[PDB]
Amino acid sequence: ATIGRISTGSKSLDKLLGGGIETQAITEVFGEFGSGKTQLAHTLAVMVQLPPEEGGLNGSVIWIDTENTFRPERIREIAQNRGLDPDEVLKHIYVARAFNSNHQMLLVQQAEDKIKELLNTDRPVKLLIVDSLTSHFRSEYIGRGALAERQQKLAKHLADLHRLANLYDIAVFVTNQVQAILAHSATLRVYLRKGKGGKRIARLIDAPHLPEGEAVFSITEKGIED
Numbered sequence: 001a002t003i004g005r006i007s008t009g010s011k012s013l014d015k016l017l018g019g020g021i022e023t024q025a026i027t028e029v030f031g032e033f034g035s036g037k038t039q040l041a042h043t044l045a046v047m048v049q050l051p052p053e054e055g056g057l058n059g060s061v062i063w064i065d066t067e068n069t070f071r072p073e074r075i076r077e078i079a080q081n082r083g084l085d086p087d088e089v090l091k092h093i094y095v096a097r098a099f100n101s102n103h104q105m106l107l108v109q110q111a112e113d114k115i116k117e118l119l120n121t122d123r124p125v126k127l128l129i130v131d132s133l134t135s136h137f138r139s140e141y142i143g144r145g146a147l148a149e150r151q152q153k154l155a156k157h158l159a160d161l162h163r164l165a166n167l168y169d170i171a172v173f174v175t176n177q178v179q180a181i182l183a184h185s186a187t188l189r190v191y192l193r194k195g196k197g198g199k200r201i202a203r204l205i206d207a208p209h210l211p212e213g214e215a216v217f218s219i220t221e222k223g224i225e226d
């Protein structure tokens with residue numbers, strides 16, 4: 001029942017997060033296009049595989065991809081440059097493409113099967129990524145009355161995700177795109193934005209009991225880092 005933390009690769013962002021993203025929680029990253037949401041997801045999918053003294057949880061990953069932006073070679077590069085075996089690392093990421101929102105919801109039920117299978121093995125699932133949490137919902141639920149219906153379906157989907165996080169001690173990491181779609185209650189919302197000089201800036205939103213500064217990071221051949 002203790003909480004585990006997965007390093008993001010950035011010391012700056014890790015400090016903002018209290019050491020990394022938490023198990024038994026849904027962390028939502030949100031921001032405009034190009035703000036680094038997907039690159040952070042890729043980095044986390046490598047970092048979680050590290051031992052705990054290196055910031056990981058010796059864990060496997062389930063990834064629900066909605067817009068086909070998962071890149072196996074980016075995983076390999078990030079792994080390679082952090083001293084891990086690129087091919088081994090891919091072996092422990094289980095990617096499924098969600099065709100629509102209803103399929104996305106079914107894939108969360110299927111994730112529980114994979115989770116159970118690995119639970120008391122040496123590489124339990126420790127990270128579940130949904131990229132994008134909201135893209136299908138934005139496309140499908142549109143027009144008069146759609147706000148209530150969309151928020152309703154999303155809340156149920158997030159409830160499924162919360163259950164998996166808490167029941168199996170897993171960090172859930174979801175993405176959400178904004179044009180400068182309420183994610184019910186993610187545990188923690190992190191706003192990402194592009195800054196000058198190729199830097200990215202992160203800020204915690206509506207978290208008055210947590211740090212109020214901003215983290216600054218780059219996107220490199222190691223994925224995310226200061």
Ligand SMILES: Nc1ncnc2c1ncn2[C@@H]1O[C@H](COP(=O)(O)OP(=O)(O)NP(=O)(O)O)[C@@H](O)[C@H]1O
Nearest residue numbers: 032033034035036037038039040074177219220221
């Ligand atoms: N291999 C790489 N090495 C370094 N930087 C990279 C690499 N791949 C992507 N990037 C950077 O990452 C940016 C895209 O980040 P990404 O994480 O895809 O944004 P995003 O928030 O997911 N965009 P969107 O899905 O449209 O809402 C690119 O514009 C590059 O600046």
Ligand SMILES: [Mg+2]
Nearest residue numbers: 037038039069
């Ligand atoms: Mg993306």
